[PDB]
Design an enzyme around this catalytic site. Sequence first.
Site, PDB file in Angstrom:
ATOM      1  N   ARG A 164       0.807  -1.191   0.000  1.00 46.61           N
ATOM      2  CA  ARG A 164       0.000   0.000   0.000  1.00 46.61           C
ATOM      3  C   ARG A 164       0.869   1.282   0.000  1.00 46.61           C
ATOM      4  O   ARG A 164       0.582   2.226   0.697  1.00 46.61           O
ATOM      5  CB  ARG A 164      -0.988  -0.009   1.152  1.00 46.61           C
ATOM      6  N   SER A 237     -11.096  -0.590   3.584  1.00 46.06           N
ATOM      7  CA  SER A 237     -10.272  -1.035   4.687  1.00 46.06           C
ATOM      8  C   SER A 237      -9.471   0.129   5.189  1.00 46.06           C
ATOM      9  O   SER A 237      -8.717   0.673   4.421  1.00 46.06           O
ATOM     10  CB  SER A 237      -9.400  -2.207   4.239  1.00 46.06           C
ATOM     11  N   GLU A 333      -4.854   3.515   5.711  1.00 44.80           N
ATOM     12  CA  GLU A 333      -4.795   3.472   4.295  1.00 44.80           C
ATOM     13  C   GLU A 333      -5.177   4.798   3.641  1.00 44.80           C
ATOM     14  O   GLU A 333      -4.461   5.278   2.799  1.00 44.80           O
ATOM     15  CB  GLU A 333      -5.598   2.301   3.769  1.00 44.80           C
TER      16      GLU A 333
HETATM   17  C1  LIG Z   1     -15.424   0.221  -0.886  1.00 42.10           C
HETATM   18  C2  LIG Z   1     -13.928   0.309  -1.114  1.00 42.10           C
HETATM   19  C3  LIG Z   1     -13.134  -0.816  -1.432  1.00 42.10           C
HETATM   20  C4  LIG Z   1     -11.736  -0.675  -1.675  1.00 42.10           C
HETATM   21  N1  LIG Z   1     -10.941  -1.745  -1.888  1.00 42.10           N
HETATM   22  C5  LIG Z   1      -9.673  -1.616  -2.171  1.00 42.10           C
HETATM   23  C6  LIG Z   1      -8.841  -2.788  -2.481  1.00 42.10           C
HETATM   24  O1  LIG Z   1      -9.350  -3.928  -2.523  1.00 42.10           O
HETATM   25  N2  LIG Z   1      -7.537  -2.585  -2.657  1.00 42.10           N
HETATM   26  C7  LIG Z   1      -6.946  -1.361  -2.585  1.00 42.10           C
HETATM   27  O2  LIG Z   1      -5.712  -1.199  -2.774  1.00 42.10           O
HETATM   28  N3  LIG Z   1      -7.674  -0.268  -2.322  1.00 42.10           N
HETATM   29  C8  LIG Z   1      -8.985  -0.337  -2.075  1.00 42.10           C
HETATM   30  N4  LIG Z   1      -9.704   0.785  -1.790  1.00 42.10           N
HETATM   31  C9  LIG Z   1      -9.046   2.071  -1.751  1.00 42.10           C
HETATM   32  C10 LIG Z   1      -9.149   2.870  -3.043  1.00 42.10           C
HETATM   33  O3  LIG Z   1     -10.171   2.443  -3.934  1.00 42.10           O
HETATM   34  C11 LIG Z   1      -7.815   2.843  -3.837  1.00 42.10           C
HETATM   35  O4  LIG Z   1      -6.855   3.279  -2.911  1.00 42.10           O
HETATM   36  C12 LIG Z   1      -7.805   3.740  -5.071  1.00 42.10           C
HETATM   37  O5  LIG Z   1      -6.609   3.668  -5.788  1.00 42.10           O
HETATM   38  C13 LIG Z   1      -7.957   5.252  -4.826  1.00 42.10           C
HETATM   39  O6  LIG Z   1      -8.284   5.829  -6.088  1.00 42.10           O
HETATM   40  P1  LIG Z   1      -9.055   7.281  -6.212  1.00 42.10           P
HETATM   41  O7  LIG Z   1      -8.918   7.621  -7.705  1.00 42.10           O
HETATM   42  O8  LIG Z   1     -10.335   7.105  -5.548  1.00 42.10           O
HETATM   43  O9  LIG Z   1      -7.970   8.099  -5.269  1.00 42.10           O
HETATM   44  P2  LIG Z   1      -8.381   9.414  -4.372  1.00 42.10           P
HETATM   45  O10 LIG Z   1      -9.079   8.890  -3.132  1.00 42.10           O
HETATM   46  O11 LIG Z   1      -9.069  10.300  -5.347  1.00 42.10           O
HETATM   47  O12 LIG Z   1      -6.833   9.883  -4.149  1.00 42.10           O
HETATM   48  C14 LIG Z   1      -5.948   9.118  -3.323  1.00 42.10           C
HETATM   49  C15 LIG Z   1      -4.598   9.756  -3.229  1.00 42.10           C
HETATM   50  O13 LIG Z   1      -3.935   9.756  -4.536  1.00 42.10           O
HETATM   51  C16 LIG Z   1      -3.767  11.125  -4.972  1.00 42.10           C
HETATM   52  N5  LIG Z   1      -3.999  11.121  -6.441  1.00 42.10           N
HETATM   53  C17 LIG Z   1      -5.134  10.729  -7.034  1.00 42.10           C
HETATM   54  N6  LIG Z   1      -5.002  10.805  -8.350  1.00 42.10           N
HETATM   55  C18 LIG Z   1      -3.737  11.246  -8.562  1.00 42.10           C
HETATM   56  C19 LIG Z   1      -2.950  11.523  -9.713  1.00 42.10           C
HETATM   57  N7  LIG Z   1      -3.502  11.407 -10.876  1.00 42.10           N
HETATM   58  N8  LIG Z   1      -1.693  11.928  -9.571  1.00 42.10           N
HETATM   59  C20 LIG Z   1      -1.173  12.146  -8.341  1.00 42.10           C
HETATM   60  N9  LIG Z   1      -1.880  11.889  -7.208  1.00 42.10           N
HETATM   61  C21 LIG Z   1      -3.105  11.452  -7.315  1.00 42.10           C
HETATM   62  C22 LIG Z   1      -4.726  11.992  -4.174  1.00 42.10           C
HETATM   63  O14 LIG Z   1      -4.194  13.302  -4.003  1.00 42.10           O
HETATM   64  C23 LIG Z   1      -4.799  11.240  -2.872  1.00 42.10           C
HETATM   65  O15 LIG Z   1      -3.682  11.556  -2.120  1.00 42.10           O
HETATM   66  C24 LIG Z   1     -11.108   0.662  -1.565  1.00 42.10           C
HETATM   67  C25 LIG Z   1     -11.922   1.790  -1.304  1.00 42.10           C
HETATM   68  C26 LIG Z   1     -13.312   1.656  -1.050  1.00 42.10           C
HETATM   69  C27 LIG Z   1     -14.170   2.890  -0.780  1.00 42.10           C
HETATM   70  N1  LIG Z   2      -7.728  -1.931   1.088  1.00 46.38           N
HETATM   71  C1  LIG Z   2      -9.060  -1.963   0.811  1.00 46.38           C
HETATM   72  O1  LIG Z   2      -9.757  -0.986   0.805  1.00 46.38           O
HETATM   73  C2  LIG Z   2      -9.785  -3.232   0.498  1.00 46.38           C
HETATM   74  C3  LIG Z   2     -11.174  -3.321   0.424  1.00 46.38           C
HETATM   75  C4  LIG Z   2     -11.725  -4.567   0.116  1.00 46.38           C
HETATM   76  C5  LIG Z   2     -10.907  -5.672  -0.093  1.00 46.38           C
HETATM   77  N2  LIG Z   2      -9.567  -5.514   0.016  1.00 46.38           N
HETATM   78  C6  LIG Z   2      -8.619  -6.562  -0.294  1.00 46.38           C
HETATM   79  O2  LIG Z   2      -9.289  -7.542  -1.027  1.00 46.38           O
HETATM   80  C7  LIG Z   2      -8.986  -8.821  -0.513  1.00 46.38           C
HETATM   81  C8  LIG Z   2     -10.207  -9.320   0.292  1.00 46.38           C
HETATM   82  O3  LIG Z   2     -10.478  -8.466   1.424  1.00 46.38           O
HETATM   83  P1  LIG Z   2     -11.160  -9.019   2.824  1.00 46.38           P
HETATM   84  O4  LIG Z   2     -11.313  -7.719   3.548  1.00 46.38           O
HETATM   85  O5  LIG Z   2     -12.177 -10.052   2.594  1.00 46.38           O
HETATM   86  O6  LIG Z   2     -10.187  -9.963   3.621  1.00 46.38           O
HETATM   87  P2  LIG Z   2     -10.125 -11.546   3.548  1.00 46.38           P
HETATM   88  O7  LIG Z   2      -9.961 -12.179   2.220  1.00 46.38           O
HETATM   89  O8  LIG Z   2     -11.188 -12.014   4.513  1.00 46.38           O
HETATM   90  O9  LIG Z   2      -8.739 -11.796   4.254  1.00 46.38           O
HETATM   91  C9  LIG Z   2      -8.677 -11.305   5.600  1.00 46.38           C
HETATM   92  C10 LIG Z   2      -7.256 -11.065   6.015  1.00 46.38           C
HETATM   93  O10 LIG Z   2      -6.510 -12.207   5.720  1.00 46.38           O
HETATM   94  C11 LIG Z   2      -5.551 -11.940   4.669  1.00 46.38           C
HETATM   95  N3  LIG Z   2      -5.514 -13.144   3.811  1.00 46.38           N
HETATM   96  C12 LIG Z   2      -6.519 -13.996   3.456  1.00 46.38           C
HETATM   97  N4  LIG Z   2      -6.050 -15.005   2.655  1.00 46.38           N
HETATM   98  C13 LIG Z   2      -4.748 -14.782   2.485  1.00 46.38           C
HETATM   99  C14 LIG Z   2      -3.701 -15.498   1.804  1.00 46.38           C
HETATM  100  N5  LIG Z   2      -4.051 -16.636   1.128  1.00 46.38           N
HETATM  101  N6  LIG Z   2      -2.481 -14.936   1.852  1.00 46.38           N
HETATM  102  C15 LIG Z   2      -2.225 -13.824   2.562  1.00 46.38           C
HETATM  103  N7  LIG Z   2      -3.160 -13.146   3.263  1.00 46.38           N
HETATM  104  C16 LIG Z   2      -4.387 -13.574   3.225  1.00 46.38           C
HETATM  105  C17 LIG Z   2      -5.871 -10.572   4.028  1.00 46.38           C
HETATM  106  O11 LIG Z   2      -4.642  -9.864   3.629  1.00 46.38           O
HETATM  107  P3  LIG Z   2      -4.521  -8.826   2.436  1.00 46.38           P
HETATM  108  O12 LIG Z   2      -5.443  -7.690   2.796  1.00 46.38           O
HETATM  109  O13 LIG Z   2      -3.014  -8.481   2.569  1.00 46.38           O
HETATM  110  O14 LIG Z   2      -4.994  -9.549   1.142  1.00 46.38           O
HETATM  111  C18 LIG Z   2      -6.603  -9.923   5.206  1.00 46.38           C
HETATM  112  O15 LIG Z   2      -5.711  -9.393   6.181  1.00 46.38           O
HETATM  113  C19 LIG Z   2      -7.801  -8.661   0.374  1.00 46.38           C
HETATM  114  O16 LIG Z   2      -6.692  -9.043  -0.377  1.00 46.38           O
HETATM  115  C20 LIG Z   2      -7.875  -7.199   0.811  1.00 46.38           C
HETATM  116  O17 LIG Z   2      -6.618  -6.532   0.902  1.00 46.38           O
HETATM  117  C21 LIG Z   2      -9.034  -4.352   0.289  1.00 46.38           C
END
Ligand SMILES: Cc1cc2nc3c(=O)[nH]c(=O)nc-3n(C[C@H](O)[C@H](O)[C@H](O)COP(=O)(O)OP(=O)(O)OC[C@H]3O[C@@H](n4cnc5c(N)ncnc54)[C@H](O)[C@@H]3O)c2cc1C
Ligand SMILES: NC(=O)c1ccc[n+]([C@@H]2O[C@H](COP(=O)([O-])OP(=O)(O)OC[C@H]3O[C@@H](n4cnc5c(N)ncnc54)[C@H](OP(=O)(O)O)[C@@H]3O)[C@@H](O)[C@H]2O)c1
Length: 337
Positions: A164, A237, A333
Site C-alpha cells: 500500500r 479497509s 490506508e
Molecule cells: C469500498 C472500497 C473498497 C476498496 N478496496 C480496495 C482494495 O481492494 N484494494 C486497494 O488497494 N484499495 C482499495 N480501496 C481504496 C481505493 O479504492 C484505492 O486506494 C484507489 O486507488 C484510490 O483511487 P481514487 O482515484 O479514488 O484516489 P483518491 O481517493 O481520489 O486519491 C488518493 C490519493 O492519490 C492522490 N492522487 C489521485 N489521483 C492522482 C494523480 N492522478 N496523480 C497524483 N496523485 C493522485 C490523491 O491526491 C490522494 O492523495 C477501496 C476503497 C473503497 C471505498
Molecule cells: N484496502 C481496501 O480498501 C480493500 C477493500 C476490500 C478488499 N480488500 C482486499 O481484497 C482482498 C479481500 O479483502 P477481505 O477484507 O475479505 O479480507 P479476507 O480475504 O477475509 O482476508 C482477511 C485477512 O486475511 C488476509 N488473507 C486472506 N487469505 C490470504 C492469503 N491466502 N495470503 C495472505 N493473506 C491472506 C488478508 O490480507 P490482504 O489484505 O493483505 O490480502 C486480510 O488481512 C484482500 O486481499 C484485501 O486486501 C481491500
Amino acid sequence: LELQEHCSLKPYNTFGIDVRARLLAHARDEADVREALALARERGLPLLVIGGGSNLLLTRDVEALVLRMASQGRRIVSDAADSVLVEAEAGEAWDPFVQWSLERGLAGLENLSLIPGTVGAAPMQNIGAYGVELKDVFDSLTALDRQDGTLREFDRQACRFGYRDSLFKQEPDRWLILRVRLRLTRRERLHLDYGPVRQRLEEEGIASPTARDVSRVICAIRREKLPDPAVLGNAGSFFKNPLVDATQAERLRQAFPDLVGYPQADGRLKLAAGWLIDKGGWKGFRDGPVGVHAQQALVLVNHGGATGAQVRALAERIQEDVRRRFGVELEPEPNLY
Ligand SMILES: Cc1cc2nc3c(=O)[nH]c(=O)nc-3n(C[C@H](O)[C@H](O)[C@H](O)COP(=O)(O)OP(=O)(O)OC[C@H]3O[C@@H](n4cnc5c(N)ncnc54)[C@H](O)[C@@H]3O)c2cc1C
Ligand SMILES: NC(=O)c1ccc[n+]([C@@H]2O[C@H](COP(=O)([O-])OP(=O)(O)OC[C@H]3O[C@@H](n4cnc5c(N)ncnc54)[C@H](OP(=O)(O)O)[C@@H]3O)[C@@H](O)[C@H]2O)c1
C-alpha cells in the site's frame, strides 16, 4: 475547466464528508492539468489532486484548487502475444478499465476487479486484492513533476512500490500522474491463493476457467460483503495489515494462539488487522455518527453526518487501543487532508 468556487466536496469522496473547496476544477488532459497548475499558482493556492475520492479523508474546508482528474483514453500500445502492453489515462475509472482489459482477452487485472477509484491513483497506493498488486503488472507511467512542470516517465523500479505504498505516497504533492502503462498477459496461470476465490470458482464448474471467470467471482464476493460508500460512507479497509518482527510474532502468539498472521520470505509476520480490531472488541462499535461496520472490522463508517475530524478521531482511538492491547501500531490506508 468548469472552475467552481466554494463548493461542496461531498459527492467527491466516498466517506461522504461535507467540506468545501475554494476552487474545484475538472481536468480532461495535459493542457488542462498544466492550466490548473498555472492557475493554482496564479491564485497563490496549493493544488489538491483527486481521482474518485475512494482513498481520501477530508477533515476541513480545502483552501486550495481541487482538481478532479477525469481524462480518458484506454488502448493497446503493443501486442507481444503472451503479453500485451496497455495504457490508460489517469481519469479512467478503474473497474471499467479492468472490464475493458478482460473483454480483450487480457489477464492480470482480474483480481483487482471492483476496486473503486481511478487508473491515475492506482500506482500511488499500489492497489492490491486477493494476492495481486498493481506493481505485478506495472510497466511504466508518465508524471508531471510539480517542481518545474516537466514530464517524466517512471519505470517499475523508479516507483519504489511497497505494500500500500509508492514513491508517490512517500513524496506527496510532487508528482502528478497523467497516464499509466500495464503489461497484461494471455495464457498464464490464474491467481487463486485466496480460499474463497478458489472455492467460489470451483462451485461454478467452468470446464476451462479464465480471467473473466475469476473476475465475476471476485465481483460477487465483494458485492456480497463490502459496504457500498453510496449507502454507508466509507473508504474501504481503513487500516493496513501490520508486519511484525519474528520475536514479536513469537510473543503475540504466546499471548494469543488464535492469532491470524501470514509468514513472509524474510521471516516477519503480516498480521491480519481485521482479526486485531475484532479481538480488541471494536467490531460494530458505534458512538455518535461514526463506527466500525458490524461485519467488516476494517471498515470505518460514517452512519450519516460525520465530520472528517470524527472519523479521524475514531481512527486514532482504535489505533491507540490496539497499541495498548497488542503492542501493534495500525497504519491508515486513506490519505488525510
Ligand atoms: C469500498 C472500497 C473498497 C476498496 N478496496 C480496495 C482494495 O481492494 N484494494 C486497494 O488497494 N484499495 C482499495 N480501496 C481504496 C481505493 O479504492 C484505492 O486506494 C484507489 O486507488 C484510490 O483511487 P481514487 O482515484 O479514488 O484516489 P483518491 O481517493 O481520489 O486519491 C488518493 C490519493 O492519490 C492522490 N492522487 C489521485 N489521483 C492522482 C494523480 N492522478 N496523480 C497524483 N496523485 C493522485 C490523491 O491526491 C490522494 O492523495 C477501496 C476503497 C473503497 C471505498
Ligand atoms: N484496502 C481496501 O480498501 C480493500 C477493500 C476490500 C478488499 N480488500 C482486499 O481484497 C482482498 C479481500 O479483502 P477481505 O477484507 O475479505 O479480507 P479476507 O480475504 O477475509 O482476508 C482477511 C485477512 O486475511 C488476509 N488473507 C486472506 N487469505 C490470504 C492469503 N491466502 N495470503 C495472505 N493473506 C491472506 C488478508 O490480507 P490482504 O489484505 O493483505 O490480502 C486480510 O488481512 C484482500 O486481499 C484485501 O486486501 C481491500
